[PDB]
Design a protein around this ligand. Structure first.
Ligand SMILES: Cc1cc2c(C(N)=O)cccc2n1-c1nc2c(c(NCc3ccccc3)n1)COCC2
Ligand SMILES: Cc1cc2c(C(N)=O)cccc2n1-c1nc2c(c(NCc3ccccc3)n1)COCC2
Ligand SMILES: Nc1ncnc2c1ncn2[C@@H]1O[C@H](COP(=O)(O)OP(=O)(O)O)[C@@H](O)[C@H]1O
Lengths: 735, 496
């Protein structure tokens, strides 16, 4: 079967011309890490690149870049043959010129100022009839060769000369512009984008197989998340890189036109897409199409909603059309649109984490050069409530300040702006310091679903809790098989209790990292808001988005907030049962045990917690979080001081030994007071940048202890209320 | 298709899709074109989208179309054979004027298939795709309970794409026409189905599950006192209808039993349903307390409606005292023990027919706060007490918990059940769970044995709780021979 062709996929490397393979790949073709490789394809064209060795990408797979996928005219799901080509090449004369589509506003020489600097120390090959793309110079421009030395023998070298004629040649329809959006342009959405690959690549890349088998492909995908998360360029990229006819309808334009032709327009949208098979239809605004919850107004609204329902219901085999849609909330859509055959597959995307946000900055700043002291990693750390469009706007906004701080002194007012100054436009760090000050982000109060960064290693002590948490949620995650072998269902959730300020939230975060699971935190105010507001559909989406992000962990902070607000143990004439806890009970009863979703309840007063939530099957597992011991207190001190200059003589072991009945909050305020004293001494001494032993010794005087002994006694009475290890302590079997 | 009748399908959204004025004409001419194709059959797919006459009250054309349908179905004389079937989600989501005589008199309610019902629905959708010798569809239809018939139809295809994707990467056969000599080798694997139940999010999860249980009286040991009265209280009117008309005694409408928590009240009700071969409907506490807080009290209407159409059925109310606990209990507020939800249940139970085989079972752990009116004769006059499991019944609880675990020969469950006396079913359950946890932990740590050993149970026996106190047993008994009263007339002699 000629075992030489392999499938093509996307490369995670950010390099321009780098091809990554697996370990048993170059050992068969006896090629080194800097040899010459020749690749072929359709249209009777060849290619040449540089093979790079990598053993971390995958097990047996070849990577392949975007700048050459369009150059060789290759699309996904195709076969590619690779063979070594040890041919000595040497370029002598070159002649490249850009296309008159991206050179607007550029004058003067442009060959000895951009092309010469980037060619050196690269030795990149080039074949005849190729459109390479280069990023930099505050723009995205390309060049095309029309006449040079006979192919091949093309090697870049500083000794090579170049020349120009002065007449750009327009591009044709055979090639595709690389300025559009592809898979490499998506940053942060890794797990969510991975799903669309296994749902839209089968029907669009292999049509004859679907008109051969009886499998019904999905007829609709609903994307989610707040505006700006990137629901549109995802749909445009999965169309641009799949060769499917992308047809965009926004959703407000349907209501923009007169009543009577709006239905006809999105009707004919479906037939014009069908004849362009394979096709892909994306509806940008859908909550503005079917808000069938409180509107109940407008004869044409229902007519358009039903017209869409009919157009998507009659999606038989016929041709390959995929109808994706975007909206903000799951409940803001007509439930009749969620039926089978209209929207069966739903993918929810959200705010990218720090790692997800880091990869979204450089994609938007690849054109603007940075300085040696400008790092994008630290700027994606203090921001947590920024949507993907927020940072896209922030990059440009910093760019105007960067150019404004120099145009005042340059004072070059003319009709046409010379292209010899963009090379000197380097952004500074102060350009970004102002960027996070006046920028007001949109998505700030939402469910942050991110994997934490706190592990068990950075938590000292608490071996008693470490051992039971690891055997209660980690075992069903890392060893599913040993549970079916023993016929034991995993526990649904655990509620732990303890004095305030002892790290219950951090413990839940740490157990999420051990299982490599997502983490969702619901604090007290979010739980008590729906109690006062009499709006109790909010737990529905909480439990919905907790289960779609499998595997996840659900954490409820200060669960006793409603009981405290109602009175507690007695309060009013009623008991300890309310409506919000009832909704949580209903949602937990209906969950599937085979899923890896896990609910963790945190409380400081477990005596006022409703007994029904602790019933077996919901939160039967109760563990007690005590005060940190000597080993765990050092961890709290060093976590607080990990960002501060600590002197060598400042011994944290002794400080943690001295404080015994101290909570995490008590150590936190000790560290904060020491830092305040150090800052004040540094400020007053100006008229030293190191925290000294005296700072901690003096701040140790105002040492509080917020947790009293009576509290520890009342928590214990609760603890071996449920321990009861009496009676059957000594048992001997007969034989 | 199998009756040779002209099938004409109208969805229901297409009526609202077209302009106002011809939509009425289209579903009008739909009826005459069906009549001349006699015999005919008309099915309306979306009907809740046609007549949502409960909260809409908006749109002149909506009422016009609803009335046009009412006129088209009212004028259904003999003439020709046309049958107008329709589909909708809820009974209350339909215009009540459509339920009149001559429009929709016959109603059939279908629901989620059970494990047996789901098993026969898999192979019909996978008859074309060949399976392996280790792929069994029975075990995959067991852990799923909230899957609609379309859910598994989608799941089969979804597993098919994974099955072909795991091999197309290595086959690497890219061409225009795909050869037919490879489908014969497309065999689905069990791992194709393991991933299928992970990312698939089912739709119907929070609904009334109406299925026949699988727990019988044989697997329940002991409880002969309750076995004898339950068998003579609901089984007799089901298996011997004639002996009741012969003796002129009406069957009891329902029985409420009480007992300490975690003793198997739900399992007892399930077992008595299998003995009578009757359907079982369970209503837990949260579903009862949701409508109390929500002030939405039409929910008991459909509960009692779907409990009576599935004749014969058994209706089970779990923790009936939930509303009383939420309101305070014996005293609580200035009010008594009467509320709105229990009032609706009383109204629905008073209006039921005794000749039907529907049966209501109430379960509670605090019968002192139960409203007295629900225990009035004719509604729940029969009260039976569920005690702690005895030695014979505790072995059943242990073996039910351990029926899926590797039990060693030396592990004697009879002795373990003998040792624990005042232990509830929950206490034995946590003992078994703790022993399984210890065995799993030892197996995991020993890797760096696949059998539960005697030591696992012996060590886990140390943390043996007893959640039910003696004061609780005393307070339940005070309630029990509160209503026993076998004094006074204990010795009677007739004259002759
Ligand atoms: C700033 C900080 C404040 C704080 C508090 C508090 N009431 O201020 C309570 C518990 C932990 C706390 N931390 C804290 N924060 C961190 C860590 C850490 N050490 C491990 C730990 C966790 C729970 C328990 C013990 C010790 N402690 C470890 O690395 C991540 C951040
Ligand atoms: C897992 C299980 C837990 C449990 C509990 C509990 N609070 O954990 C209470 C009562 C019965 C329980 N079962 C249980 N489950 C089953 C059976 C069975 N034995 C019969 C029985 C029923 C009620 C009573 C006695 C004994 N017991 C029998 O086969 C079906 C499943
Ligand atoms: N997750 C993301 N990855 C890459 N770019 C993004 C992302 N989210 C937003 N952007 C950028 O923000 C800009 C605005 O996106 P926008 O059209 O608001 O997305 P949507 O239509 O989904 O709200 C786009 O040009 C896009 O490049």
């Amino acid at each position: 079967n000629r075992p030489n062709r392999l499938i093509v996929d996307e490369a995670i490397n950010e390099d321009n011309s780098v091809v990554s393979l697996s370990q048993p790949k170059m050992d068969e073709l006896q090629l080194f890490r800097g040899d010459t490789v020749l690749l072929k394809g359709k249209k009777r064209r060849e290619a040449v690149c540089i093979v790079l060795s990598d053993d971390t990408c995958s097990d047996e797979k070849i990577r392949m870049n975007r700048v050459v996928r369009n150059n060789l005219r290759v699309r996904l799901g195709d076969v590619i043959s690779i063979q070594p080509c040890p041919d000595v090449k040497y370029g002598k004369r070159i002649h490249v010129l850009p296309i008159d589509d991206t050179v607007e506003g550029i004058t003067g020489n442009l060959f000895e100022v951009y092309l010469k600097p980037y060619f050196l120390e690269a030795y990149r090959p080039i074949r005849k009839g190729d459109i390479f793309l280069v990023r930099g110079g505050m723009r995205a421009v390309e060049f095309k060769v029309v006449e040079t030395d006979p192919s091949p023998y093309c090697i870049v070298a500083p000794d090579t000369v170049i020349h120009c004629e002065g007449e750009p040649i327009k591009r044709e329809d055979e090639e595709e512009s690389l300025n559009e959006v592809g898979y490499d342009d998506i940053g942060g959405c890794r797990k969510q984008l991975a799903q669309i690959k296994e749902m839209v690549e089968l029907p669009l890349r292999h049509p004859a197989l679907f008109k051969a088998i009886g499998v019904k492909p999905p007829r609709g995908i609903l994307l989610y998340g707040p505006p700006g998360t990137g629901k549109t360029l995802i749909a445009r990229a999965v169309a641009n890189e799949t060769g499917a006819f992308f047809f965009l309808i926004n959703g407000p334009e349907i209501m923009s036109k007169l009543a009577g032709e709006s239905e006809s327009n999105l009707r004919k949208a479906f037939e014009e897409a069908e004849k362009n098979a394979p096709a892909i239809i994306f509806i940008d605004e859908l909550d503005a199409i079917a808000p069938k919850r409180e509107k109940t107004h407008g004869e044409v609204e229902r007519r358009i909603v039903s017209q869409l329902l009919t157009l998507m219901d009659g999606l038989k085999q016929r041709a390959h059309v995929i109808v994706m849609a975007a909206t903000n909330r799951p409940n803001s859509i007509d439930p009749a649109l969620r039926r089978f055959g209209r929207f069966d597959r739903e993918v929810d995307i959200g705010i990218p984490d720090a790692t997800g946000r880091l990869e979204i900055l450089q994609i938007h700043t690849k054109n603007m050069k940075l300085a040696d002291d400008v790092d994008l990693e630290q700027v994606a750390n203090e921001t947590h409530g920024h949507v993907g469009a927020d940072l896209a706007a922030l990059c440009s906004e910093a760019a105007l300040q960067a150019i404004r701080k120099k145009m005042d002194l340059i004072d070059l007012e003319d009709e046409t702006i010379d292209a010899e100054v963009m090379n000197s436009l380097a952004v500074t760090m102060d350009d970004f310091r102002w960027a996070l000050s006046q920028s007001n982000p949109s998505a700030l109060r939402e469910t942050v679903v991110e994997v934490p960064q706190v592990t068990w290693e950075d938590i000292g002590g608490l071996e008693d809790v470490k051992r039971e948490l690891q055997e209660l949620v980690q075992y069903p995650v890392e060893h599913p098989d040993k549970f079916l072998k023993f016929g034991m269902t995993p526990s649904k959730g655990v509620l732990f209790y303890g004095p305030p300020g002892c790290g219950k939230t951090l413990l839940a975060k740490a157990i999420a990292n051990e299982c490599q699971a997502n983490f969702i935190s619901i604090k007290g105010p979010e739980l008590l808001t729906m109690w006062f507001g009499e709006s109790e559909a909010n737990v529905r989406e909480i439990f919905d988005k907790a289960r779609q992000a499998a595997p996840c962990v659900l954490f409820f902070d200060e669960l006793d907030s409603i009981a405290k607000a109602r009175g507690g143990n007695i309060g009013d004439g009623g008991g300890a049962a309310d409506r919000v806890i009832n909704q949580i009970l209903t949602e937990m009863d209906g969950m599937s045990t085979k899923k890896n979703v896990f609910i963790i309840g945190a409380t400081n007063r477990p005596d006022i917690i409703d007994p029904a939530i602790l019933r077996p099957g919901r939160l039967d597992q109760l563990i007690y979080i005590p005060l940190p011991d000597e080993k765990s207190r050092v961890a709290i001190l060093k976590a607080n001081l990990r960002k501060s200059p600590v002197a060598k003589d400042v011994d944290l072991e002794f400080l943690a030994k001295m404080t015994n009945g101290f909570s995490g909050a008590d150590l936190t305020e000790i560290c904060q007071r020491a830092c305040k004293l150090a800052i004040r001494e540094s400020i007053e001494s100006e008229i030293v940048p190191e925290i000294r032993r005296d700072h901690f010794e003096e701040a140790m005087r105002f040492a509080r202890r917020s947790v009293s002994d009576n509290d520890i006694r009342k928590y214990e009475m609760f603890a071996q209320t449920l321990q009861q290890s009496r009676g059957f302590g000594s048992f001997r079997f007969p034989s």
